[PDB]
């Protein structure tokens, strides 16, 4: 019943954990505690098998541990800066080659999977710093330039006409812009990792750069030059919606160094590069 299901949604009780049943003393030639990890399987022994348990009714739910929940939180993926210093025409617009690899927090979470398919929700948080005192009337334009479309080279480039590309205009004072984006890949899922090249020569590129081109985000202050200089910083937040993930993998153990690559750097004292805290010895808790 969709209504019962609805109640479960509201209470977050869609996925319930099993109860613990009462167990008793045993004397058997069936030893559940003994097994063989060589098989590559985890011994499914439960508490009732190794001790005498009481009956307990579980009320815990796994809803929050769902992939939708894990990746369904909006996090920052880019900080765009437009700092008017001495040349408005050159400093009033910029561009970014879109990717979800520049911020460690969300990157690490997505990378716990090999392939992921999801729709995106983008929320932008623009903040205008009044460097000289007033901010005037700031109107921003964020244009999505898919790979192939002409990238504007000046603040008045014809490409800004956005005759076909999707543009979002924001007026200072109005609520934060937000829009959704359908799964964009040309494949069935996004590659979080890609053990391949775009060719078979010594100079072929390796990794997700080959498969994950999302195009360019071009921004510009629509307002013409003003007396007082401003510094507009637009923070882009991304959230995954309607998510699916395949083949889980180990979490990133060392810091990230670059986008589209698993490369890392190690110091002379590697224990400083990982989160493992050295133990005094085996018996010191």
């Amino acid at each position: 019943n969709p209504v019962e299901r609805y109640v479960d949604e509201v209470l977050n009780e869609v996925l319930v954990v099993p109860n613990i049943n009462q167990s008793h003393p045993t004397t058997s030639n069936a030893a559940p505690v003994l097994d063989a990890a060589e098989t590559g399987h985890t011994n499914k022994i439960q508490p009732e098998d190794t001790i005498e348990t009481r009956y307990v009714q579980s009320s815990q739910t796994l809803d929050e541990m769902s992939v939708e929940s894990f990746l369904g939180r909006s996090g920052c993926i880019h900080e765009s800066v437009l700092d008017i210093v001495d040349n408005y025409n050159d400093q009033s617009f910029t561009k970014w080659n879109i990717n979800l690899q520049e911020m460690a927090q969300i990157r690490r979470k997505f990378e716990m999977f090999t392939y992921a398919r999801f729709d995106s929700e983008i929320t932008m948080v623009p903040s205008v710093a009044a460097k000289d005192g007033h901010i005037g009337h700031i109107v921003m334009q964020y244009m999505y330039v898919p790979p192939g479309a002409p990238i504007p080279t000046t603040r008045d480039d014809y490409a800004w006409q956005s005759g076909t590309n999707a543009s979002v205009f924001w007026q200072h004072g109005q609520p934060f812009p937000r829009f959704s984006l359908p799964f964009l890949s040309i494949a069935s899922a996004y590659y979080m990792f890609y053990d391949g090249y775009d060719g078979d020569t010594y100079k072929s590129r390796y990794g997700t750069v080959v498969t994950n081109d999302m195009g360019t985000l071009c921004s510009r202050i629509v307002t013409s030059e003003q007396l007082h200089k401003v510094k507009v910083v637009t923070r882009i937040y991304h959230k995954a919606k309607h998510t699916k993930a395949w083949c889980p993998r180990p979490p990133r153990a060392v810091q990230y160094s670059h986008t589209h690559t698993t490369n890392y750097k190690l110091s002379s004292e590697v224990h400083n590069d990982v989160a493992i805290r050295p133990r005094t010895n085996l018996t010191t808790v």
Binding site: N1, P2, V3, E4, R5, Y6, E9, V14, L15, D63, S66, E68, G72, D119, S120, S180, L181, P182, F183, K241, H242, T243
Partner: peptide, 29 residues
């Protein structure tokens, strides 16, 4: 876009825009 259930406890799962990407978080399982 309205999924009207009845039980009365009536549910209204409205989809305000015409693209599936526009809807909120997915249901579970």
């Amino acid at each position: 876009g309205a999924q009207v259930s009845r039980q009365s406890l009536n549910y209204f799962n409205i989809n305000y825009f015409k693209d599936a990407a526009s809807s909120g978080a997915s249901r579970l399982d």
